[PDB]
Design a protein around this ligand. Structure first.
Ligand SMILES: [Zn+2]
Length: 25
């Protein structure tokens, strides 16, 4: 979840899916 993203800010419009697509650690 972009809200709990481990790395810097993801997506350019709260696109969590775009984030989790590559963020899961
Ligand atoms: Zn992320």
């Amino acid at each position: 979840a972009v809200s709990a993203c481990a790395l810097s800010k993801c997506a350019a419009a709260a696109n969590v899916a775009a984030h989790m697509t590559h963020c899961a650690k």
